[PDB]
Prior knowledge:
Distance between the termini of chain A: 33 Å
Strand content of chain A: 25-35%
Oligomer: heterodimer
Largest interface: A-B, 28 and 22 residues
Radius of gyration of chain B: 12 Å
Largest sheet of chain A: 6 strands, antiparallel, barrel
CATH superfamily of the largest domain in chain A: Trypsin-like serine proteases
Shape of chain B: elongated
Number of strands of chain A: 13
Structural class of chain B: mainly beta
Number of domains of chain A: 2
CATH architecture of the largest domain in chain A: Beta Barrel
Number of helices of chain A: 3
Distance between the termini of chain B: 38 Å
CATH architecture of chain B: Ribbon
CATH class of the largest domain in chain A: Mainly Beta
CATH topology of chain B: Laminin
Radius of gyration of chain A: 16 Å
Number of helices of chain B: 0
Number of domains of chain B: 1
Largest sheet of chain B: 2 strands, antiparallel
Order of helices and strands of chain B: EEEE
Structural class of chain A: mainly beta
Bound molecules: ligand JNJ
Amino acid sequence: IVGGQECKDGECPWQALLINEENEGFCGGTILSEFYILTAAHCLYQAKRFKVRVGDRNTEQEEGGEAVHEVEVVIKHNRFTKETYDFDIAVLRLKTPITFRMNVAPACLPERDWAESTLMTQKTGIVSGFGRTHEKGRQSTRLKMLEVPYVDRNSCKLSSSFIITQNMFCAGYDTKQEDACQGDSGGPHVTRFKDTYFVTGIVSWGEGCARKGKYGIYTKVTAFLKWIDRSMKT
Amino acid sequence: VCSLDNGDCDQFCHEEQNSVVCSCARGYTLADNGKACIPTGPYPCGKQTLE
Ligand SMILES: CN(C)Cc1nccn1-c1ccc(-c2ccc3c(C(N)=O)nn(-c4ccc5onc(N)c5c4)c3c2F)c(F)c1
């Protein structure tokens, strides 16, 4: 996360962190239930074998509330590809059930038609993660969150050097220096409606981080709502 | 009707037979008034957690 602010205690309870054998975080994720975590497909082969940590706000201090969970199954979308990063979505079923509590709770899964007409039309969404605070800097030990405006597809496709499928969407600013960055990938993009946050995107990619004329690219969750229900067994 | 104040629904709004029908996400129960969404557990999805 470049810019924005640190997440106040309990404000990003649905944030999940993918850890490698170095016990470090490389990609984020979003809690959907006790057994499920939503992430990005391109993260899966970015650590070979990994684990999911929840309820972590500070990676420096052992605080006293985190938790670790192993993945029992990896569900990568069949049409996923590294060339276009299209279908960059995946679900992870843990081996043991996440027990909800402070800083640990799931984001809501919304209904397709409604989400498209009402959540995607809101002015902004909320992105979070333990990603880089600068384009080529180091990751943040502190969990951050940033409010990013929705950008219409045409401006999106145009501002992009790469193809923007209908499975992705733009969010962020054109020149204002705020954006998601390496490390946030797979993390949550939720949208608030009447005090309830719903899952709306998955940090996917971007040409650099918060450059000019570029936005953050996210996996459009509304286009995979049925897929997710399937993946989680109804 | 869903296009004005979300058909007064707390969450999902749908126009059926020329009328509004509200619904809620798992973990919530549609209120008696057919509008509001009542959380059923202590850690309902979408709600920032308090101490
Ligand atoms: C070469 N490809 C195969 C071509 C291709 N075709 C389709 C898509 N791509 C494609 C393009 C660019 C990247 C890329 C490269 C570098 C970075 C960095 C860095 N800090 O150096 N940080 N991020 C980064 C991460 C997460 C982000 O979230 N929001 C953000 N702005 C944001 C930014 C990066 C990238 F996304 C990518 F991974 C895939």
